[PDB]
Design a protein around this nucleic acid. Structure first.
Lengths: 106, 56, 127, 119, 256, 141
RNA sequence: AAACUGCGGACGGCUCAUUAUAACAGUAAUAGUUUCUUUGGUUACAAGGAUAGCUUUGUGAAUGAUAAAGAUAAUACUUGAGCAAUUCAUUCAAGUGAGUUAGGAUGCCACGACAAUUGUAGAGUAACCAAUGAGAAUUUCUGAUCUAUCAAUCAGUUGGUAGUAUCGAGGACUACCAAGAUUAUAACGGAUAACGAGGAAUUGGGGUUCGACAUCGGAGAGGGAGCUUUACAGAUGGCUACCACUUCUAAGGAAGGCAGCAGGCGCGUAAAUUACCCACUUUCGAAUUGAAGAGGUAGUGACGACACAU
RNA sequence: AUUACUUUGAAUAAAAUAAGGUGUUUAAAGCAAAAUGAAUAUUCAAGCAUGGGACAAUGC
């Protein structure tokens, strides 16, 4: 559709073809406020219940300390990492913990 | 000094003072950066008849 | 209160409108006063901008006119006979414009040609 | 008798008739209420015409008429002059009262002079 | 907006009022009168900016209410009286008189009026209508309603008005040989001679105006304020003589 | 002409009655059928008390099934800045048709003029019309 | 001082819940309506009662609570004397692109005045014609995000006649007649973390995203609904009824609506003093003077922007 | 014969963007000062008028 009067299809084609964008569709579907525990919120506040050790993937070899946190808004259970070494001693239960993502976007 | 104009209807004169270091009302007295030279805006109402009524 | 806006109507496509604001005074409405046959009784309404409207409730005398002889004298209204809008107005004897009424030409079929609900009086001519 | 308030100082209405103070939209039209705004009809619990137990407490132009004070006498002595330690007659309102050469000079009888309708 | 507004915001005022953007929150809304909202300059602006007599609005009230300023033949005592077109101004206390004329720089200018020449003020007729009782009359550009004028006086002419007597002296027709001062948009502030008129029945009548030096511009008919006949001016023109300089000697001269 | 409940009469009726007719403005001739005809219409631009104000458009008559009112289809092109291309569009306007235009039919170019609101939708009046082809459906006003 | 009377609180300030051709932006119309204020012009030597403020008796815990009595005034309310505009029926007829048009005349019907007005010294009133005012309000043309796991939608609905109501056109409402109106050029329906615009962030060009928020327009005052005053309110720092809250309490009862300015609880990743002054800008008022948590000043403040120490 | 296209205008709120000038000492700023207010350029998409008819659509 290259014609001078053929602007109806080119707008229709671009509208339909934009939904295949894996990232553009993600920010427009109604799931950030539903499926994402954080949502548009930058950080999250919750409570610590259970502490985990997640063994590293196949190329590596170790146990990564982790905790299980239930938020104060959604109430779901999520797993959080320890940013430093020996920080599992400092962490406790039923205390305010801030959770904000990782290097990769969500 | 500077500019001297006389109000023909308000019975006063508007002047611009400049410091080089009861009938006069002094406002706008501020100095330059770091002090020293100071300026202002002196108003003189001569006769008290106009001063007592042309004043906030 | 009665309103005369189109916000409550439907589009030409049948699409029901959606309410954005509540009722406003600029589109007021008032109930009709069906001027019947009875003792002279007129209520003056306070319209917008302070103007006054004469709302006639019951009248008996109208200042009918004759065009073929150029005479305008009052005559007593007998009864409402024919109405172009509703035959049920005849039974109630509502006085509205265009209502064919009969009179006795003591000072001389008449059609009312005024707005008793607005002007406050009945006038007509000779058919 | 006359009117009166209620046990809680609620006026008994000569119009309505109730044994316990009822509430109705009210203004100075029947005296029971003092409108704060313009047309402030308030539903206030005022007593009715019944005198039952709840009622508990049951209770010069015009100066040209103080006593036949006509005008033409120009009387400033007939007008009351109670004295204070000043001799104080209140006033004489719109009339032909003595001065009356501001009234009829141009404000009432120029009038085809201060009312000229001309060509 | 339940009714008419009483406050005028600073930034919503007409741009030709010289008002600053950080001067204040509100601008003085002119009261209703002979001239329009955007066709008038408030009296407070004249005595605070164009004349610099009053430092602020505190002293503006102590001048107008003192019966010191006379607008046209009569005298006004309103702080925000709508002062529009060249209707005269008289301040006998300071022995100075002015006139509210336009200029090419899109503003209101105060030309100096002598005492003798302040007795008259030309007015442009806006419409001619015949009232009840066969009493025809005209309405001018300041809304002034006068009694029986010349029967030849039409709706879009100009008349020579008097102040003390309030009578008519001379009237100039709207023709192909007159001089006009513009009161509208692009051309407003210009003086020129009407050379051609083109009439479109549907929407507007368009005229052509040629300046004294030969510059030609075009404008709408509502904007044509006739100032004289046969290249003659009946009033004192502003400092720049109402001529339009095409920016060629505006930036260059202002450097020196 | 006279077949309804009320007595249908012209808005401006005067004894000679005469056939009232006023002159419309910017260069529109008065139709012949508006003079010798016996019809009575209270909203006709010529023989009634409705004017023709500023806006004036044109279109193709598509519907001729409503009494003294027709629908004109105006087709234009909408320009889209991003794609630098136009697109076909249309709008339907309800215009009151006076009984003067006896030969008016669907598919004929018609010039319409604005006026005060005559109905909930009808606010334009037919001024003149031009004949066109045929499609075996001679649907008139 | 008071109090009666007049004017104002329909301006201003706040918030963005509703809202998908709705509103809004440009544009044209109002020969389809129009006030308030302001401006120009026109049209008996003075009648009468009662009412507050005023004096006296109280109630109850009371609200900006409350009744009787005795009085006392108007530029408060009426009477009273020297054409304008309104309806109908007929007719004569000149600007405007456009009018049985402004306007005049004929005959009854209705309202029918220019305060029975005011300072010794510095104007006001009653209607009407026209400006105001590009104003307000209705309305014309064009223009808006996604969606077909939305393809057919509407019955006052589309058109006509007559009336009704309105300030006014109009299915805005009622009575009678016809079946019509929209739709693949996306009608109808659904979603919004949708108030719209001037604009902002970023861009070689093209574009993408944001816009509650300085200014303009729209809407609302916890939720609808109905009304009073008047020139403008369907007002809510007005009232009335219900729904949901909240306060004092003498237990009988009373009013209140911080999406105004400070401040509190909760919500949260998320956001400041329970300060002073109308002296700057402007508004209202009986008007040079009174008021303004508008506005200005003062305090916190690493949201940011500019200059600059070791 | 319209329309589209194209060229000129008319009129079009400010603030904001680009800026014309101006030693807030520079700069951010402000329209101030030592009479000037930028002509300030607009304004996507529509609407009015006009010069042209090559490329285009509408039926004769």
């Amino acid at each position: 559709a290259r014609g001078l009067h053929a602007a109806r299809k080119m707008l229709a084609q671009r509208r339909a073809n934009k939904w295949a964008d894996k990232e553009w569709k993600k920010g427009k579907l109604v799931t950030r406020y539903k499926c994402n525990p954080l949502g548009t919120a930058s950080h999250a506040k919750g409570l610590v219940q259970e502490k985990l050790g997640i063994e590293t993937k196949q190329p590596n070899s170790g146990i990564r300390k982790c905790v299980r946190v239930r938020l104060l808004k959604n109430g779901k259970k999520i797993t959080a990492f320890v940013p430093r070494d020996g920080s599992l001693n400092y962490v406790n239960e039923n205390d305010e913990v801030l959770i904000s993502g990782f290097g990769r976007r969500g | 000094t500077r500019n001297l104009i006389v109000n023909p209807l308000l019975c006063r004169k508007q002047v611009v003072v400049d410091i080089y270091h009861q009938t006069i009302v002094l406002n706008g007295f501020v100095t330059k950066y770091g002090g020293g030279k100071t300026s202002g805006f002196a108003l003189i109402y001569d006769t008290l008849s106009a001063l007592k009524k042309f004043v906030p | 209160g009665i309103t005369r806006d189109s916000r409550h109507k439907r589009r030409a496509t049948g699409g029901k409108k959606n309410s954005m604001q509540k009722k406003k005074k600029n589109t007021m409405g008032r109930q009709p006063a069906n001027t019947r046959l009875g003792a002279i009784r007129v209520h003056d309404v306070r319209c917008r901008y302070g103007i006054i409207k004469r709302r006639a409730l019951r009248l008996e005398n109208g200042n009918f006119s004759w065009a073929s002889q150029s005479i305008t004298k009052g005559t007593k209204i007998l009864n409402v006979v024919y109405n172009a809008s509703d035959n049920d107005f005849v039974r109630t004897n509502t006085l509205v414009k265009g209502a064919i009424i009969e009179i006795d030409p003591a000072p001389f079929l008449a059609c009312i040609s005024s707005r008793p609900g607005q002007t406050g009086s009945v006038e007509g001519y000779i058919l | 008798i006359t009117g009166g308030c209620d046990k809680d100082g609620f006026p008994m209405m000569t119009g309505v008739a109730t044994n316990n103070r009822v509430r109705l939209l009210l203004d100075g039209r029947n005296g029971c209420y003092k409108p704060l705004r313009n047309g402030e009809r308030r539903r206030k619990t005022v007593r009715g015409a019944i005198v039952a137990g709840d009622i508990s407490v049951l209770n010069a132009s015009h100066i040209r008429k103080l006593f036949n004070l006509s005008q033409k006498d120009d009387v400033k002595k007939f007008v009351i002059r109670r004295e204070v330690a000043r001799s104080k007659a209140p006033k004489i309102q719109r009339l032909v009262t003595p001065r009356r050469l501001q009234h009829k000079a141009q404000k009432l009888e120029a009038k085809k002079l201060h009312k000229i309708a001309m060509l | 907006a339940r009714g008419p507004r009483h406050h005028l915001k600073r930034l919503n005022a007409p741009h030709h009022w010289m008002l600053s953007k950080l001067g204040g929150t509100f601008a003085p809304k002119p009261s209703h009168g002979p001239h329009g909202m955007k066709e008038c300059l408030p009296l407070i602006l004249i005595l605070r900016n164009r004349l610099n007599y009053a430092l602020n609005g505190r002293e503006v009230t102590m001048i107008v209410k003192n019966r010191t300023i006379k607008i046209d033949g009569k005298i006004r005592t309103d702080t925000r009286y709508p002062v529009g077109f060249m209707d005269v101004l008289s301040i006998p206390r300071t022995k100075e008189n002015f006139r509210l004329m336009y200029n090419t720089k899109r503003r209101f200018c105060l030309v100096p009026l002598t005492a003798e020449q302040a007795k008259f003020k030309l007015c442009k007729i806006e419409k001619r209508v015949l009232g009840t009782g066969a009493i025809p009359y005209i309405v001018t550009h300041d809304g002034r309603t006068i009694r029986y004028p010349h029967p030849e006086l039409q709706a879009n002419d100009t008349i020579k008005l008097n102040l003390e007597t309030g009578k008519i002296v001379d009237f100039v027709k709207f023709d192909i040989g007159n001089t006009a001062m513009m009161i509208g948009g692009n051309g407003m502030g210009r003086v020129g001679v009407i050379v051609k008129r083109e009439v479109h029945p549907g929407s507007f009548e368009i005229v052509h105006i040629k300046d004294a030096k030969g510059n030609t511009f075009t404008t709408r008919l509502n904007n044509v304020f006739v100032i004289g006949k046969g290249t003659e001016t009946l009033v004192n023109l502003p400092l720049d003589k109402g001529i339009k300089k095409p920016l060629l000697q505006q930036v260059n001269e202002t450097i020196k | 002409e006279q077949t309804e409940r009320a007595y249908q009469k012209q808005v401006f009726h005067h004894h000679s009655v005469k056939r009232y007719h006023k002159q419309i403005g910017m260069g529109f001739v008065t139709p012949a059928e508006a003079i010798k005809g016996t019809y009575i219409d209270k909203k006709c631009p010529f023989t009634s008390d409705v004017s023709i104000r500023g806006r004036t458009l044109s279109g193709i008559v598509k519907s001729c099934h409503m009494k003294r009112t027709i629908i004109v289809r105006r087709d234009y092109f909408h320009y889209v800045s991003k794609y630098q291309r136009y697109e076909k569009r249309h709008k339907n306007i309800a215009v009151h048709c006076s009984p003067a235009f006896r030969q008016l039919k669907e598919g004929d170019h018609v010039v319409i003029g604005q006026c005060r609101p005559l109905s909930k939708t009808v606010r334009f009046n037919v001024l003149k019309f031009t004949s066109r082809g045929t499609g075996d459906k001679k649907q008139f006003a």
